[PDB]
């Protein structure tokens, strides 16, 4: 289909309000988790030295 | 840890340069006076206990 049709009218009211469409926000992996992952990796790299 | 690797590096660096006594004769002493005492020191201070 080349369209995405929507109903315009409702019986016991005027036209449908049709507020702007909302989408579920994409998963983020909060930058707290990423920054702490980087910090832990860097820490392990620093201590993993016998000299 | 961010400091323990530094301690490891320092310990390894100073373990690469062992230091031990080296007896030498006096100014007026004979040119072979220090051999026997130095040899006894090497004999005594060569086991694992001294290095440890």
UniProtKB/Swiss-Prot annotation, chain A:
Gene transcribed to yield this protein: 1
Subunit structure: Homododecamer. Interacts with the terminase large subunit; this interaction allows the packaging of viral DNA. Interacts (via C-terminus) with the head-to-tail adapter protein gp4; this interaction participates in the head completion. Interacts with the scaffolding protein; this interaction initiates procapsid assembly, thereby ensuring incorporation of only one portal ring per capsid. Interacts with the capsid protein.
Portion of the full sequence shown: 369 to 419 of 725
Subcellular location: Virion
Protein's job: Forms the portal vertex of the capsid. This portal plays critical roles in head assembly, genome packaging, neck/tail attachment, and genome ejection. Procapsid assembly may initiate with a nucleation complex composed of portal and scaffolding proteins. The portal protein multimerizes as a single ring-shaped homododecamer arranged around a central channel. Switches upon genome packaging from an asymmetrical conformation in the procapsid (PC-portal) to a symmetrical ring in the mature capsid (MV-portal). This change of conformation may serve as a signal for headful packaging.
Name this polypeptide is given: Portal protein
Organism for this UniProt entry: Salmonella phage P22
Superkingdom, natural source: Viruses
Similarity field: Belongs to the p22likevirus portal protein family.
């Amino acid at each position: 289909y080349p369209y995405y049709l929507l109903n315009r009218t409702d019986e016991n009211s005027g036209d449908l309000p049709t507020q702007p469409l909302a989408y579920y926000e994409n998963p983020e992996v909060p930058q707290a988790n990423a920054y702490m992952l980087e910090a832990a990796t860097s820490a392990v790299k620093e201590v993993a030295t016998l000299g | 840890d961010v400091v323990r690797p530094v301690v490891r590096k320092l310990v390894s660096e100073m373990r690469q340069n062992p230091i031990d006594v080296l007896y030498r004769p006096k100014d007026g002493a004979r040119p072979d006076a220090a051999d026997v005492l130095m040899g006894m020191y090497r004999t005594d201070m060569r086991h694992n206990t001294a290095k440890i």
